[PDB]
Amino acid sequence: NAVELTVDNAWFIAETIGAGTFPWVLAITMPYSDAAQRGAFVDRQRDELTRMGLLSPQGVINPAVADWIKVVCFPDRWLDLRYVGPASADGACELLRGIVALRTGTGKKTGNGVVALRNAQLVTFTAMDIDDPRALVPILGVGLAHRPPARFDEFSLPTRVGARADERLRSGVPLGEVVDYLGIPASARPVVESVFSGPRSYVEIVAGCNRDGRHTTTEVGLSIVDTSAGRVLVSPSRAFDGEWVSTFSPGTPFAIAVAIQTLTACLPD
C-alpha cells in the first residue's frame, strides 16, 4: 500500500528506527532544538499518530510504515530525485523532493523498495518493486508538466562546457552569448535555448549505492526537463578519452529507462 504523512510524523517515525537524518535530498531536518521543544513535539506527534492509527494504544508504531522509513533512511541501493520548477510568483519556492530506495539483504531476488515523495509540508511513502522500469518512469515524472517528448534528433556537448555555460547564464551573461559560446549547430540551438532558459522545470536524478560500509554516488546526474516544445532528456556518458559528455535526446520514457539503468551501471552493482 501507500501512506501519506507530514514531515513531523515522518521525523518521529525516523527517530523510532534510530535514523540520525533523512536522505539529504528529501530536505527533512530536525524540527525541534532544545529539550522542551523535543517534549512538545513528541507529545503532539504521539497524539496525532495515535489518532490516525499508526501508533497503537500500547505505544507501537505500525511495523510496515516504520520499515518503509527504515528502507528510506538506510537504503542499500537508491536513486534520488530533485524537482526544480517555476516559482509561486509570490516569491515562494516549494520543495518537491523524491527518493527511490531499495533495501535487500535476502529477498522476498525481488527488489521490494519504497518511494518517498516530499511535497511542501507533506511526504508520501509507497511500497513497490522497481524491477520493471515501466512502473518507475511515471513515478519520477509526476513532478513535471507531463509534456510529451519533444521532436528533435539527439546531439551532445561536453559536460564541462555545458556546466560552465549554465553557470555563466546564472551569473548574468545574456543567453545569446552563452549559446554562441556553446558552438552548437543551428538546428540544435533552439532545443538548448529552451533547456537553459524559459520555464526551467526539471528533475535531477542521482544514483547511489551502499557497498558494505562505504557509500558511493555518481559523479554526474541525469536530467529530465520540460521545454515549451516538449520533454528533453540530458544523459551524461564517458567518451573514449574519459571526458564527460552530456547528451541531449528526446524525452521518451524508453530513453529515460535506458539512461537510468546506464547511470546505475556505473555503480558497483
In contact, 224 and 240? CB cutoff 8 Å: no
Q: Which three cell numbers stand for residue 33?
A: 532544538
Residue 167 contacts residue 154 (beta carbons within 8 Å) = no
Reference 142, options 81, 213, 58; nearest CA is: 81
Cell numbers at 68, concatenated: 518503509
Measured CA to CA, the distance from residue 68 to residue 70 in angstroms comes to 5
Cell of 94: 516549494
Under a CB-based contact definition with an 8 Å cutoff, are residues 154 and 191 in contact? no
Q: What does the CA dihedral 62, 63, 68, 72 come to, rounded to 10 degrees?
A: 100
Question: What single-letter amino acid sits at 232?
Answer: V
What are residue 6's phi and psi, to 5 degrees?
-95, 180
Listed in sequence order, the residues at least 6 apart from 205 whose beta carbon sits closer than 8 Å to its beta carbon are 79, 80, 81, 82, 140, 221, 222, 223, 224, 260, 263
Side-chain-side CA neighbours of residue 73 (13 Å): 21
Apex 56 CA angle, 51 and 58, nearest 5: 125
* 3 state SS for 188-254: CHHHHHHHHCCCCEEEEEEEEEEECCEEEECCCCEEEEECCCCEEEEEEEECCCCCEEEEEEECCHH
Report the distance separating Cα 217 and Cα 209, nearest Å: 6
Residues 6+ apart with CB under 8 A from 143: 81, 83, 85, 96, 98, 117, 203
**Domains of the chain: total:** 1
Q: Which residues touch 147 (CB under 8 Å, ≥6 apart)?
A: 226, 227, 230, 231, 251
> Would you list the DSSP string of the chain?
-EEEEEHHHHHHHHHHTT-S---GGGT------SHHHHHHHHHHHHHHHHHHTSB-TTS-B-HHHHHHHHHHHS-SEEEEEEEE----SSSPPPPEEEEEEE--SS-----EEEEEEEETTEEEEEEEE-SSHHHHHHHTTTTS--PPBP----EEEEHHHHHHHHHHHHTT--HHHHHHHHT--TTTHHHHHHHHSTT-EEEEEEEEEEETTEEEE-SS-EEEEE-SS-EEEEEEEE-TTS-EEEEEEE--HHHHHHHHHHHHHTS--
Q: How far apart are CA 156 and CA 243, in angstroms?
A: 12
CA distances from 244 to 61, 108, 164, 221 (A): 46, 38, 13, 11
Q: Which residues contact 257 (CB under 8 A, 6 or more apart)?
A: 133, 134, 136, 137
| Three cell numbers, residue 36 | 522542551
Query: Alpha-carbon distance 195 to 179, whole Å?
Result: 11
- Partner residues linked to 81 by β-bridges: 98, 205
Q: Let me know: does 80 contact 99? Beta carbons within 8 Å.
A: yes
Q: Which residues contact 129 (CB under 8 A, 6 or more apart)?
A: 110, 111, 112, 113, 135
> How many other CB atoms sit within 10 Å of the CB of residue 163?
14
Would you mind telling me the total number of residues written for the chain in this entry? 269
Method: X-ray
Cβ atoms of 59 and 10 within 8 Å: the answer is no
Cell numbers given for 11: 521525523
User: What does DSSP say about strands 231-238 and 155-158: parallel, antiparallel, or unpaired?
Assistant: unpaired
- Domain enclosing residue 118, as ranges: 1-269
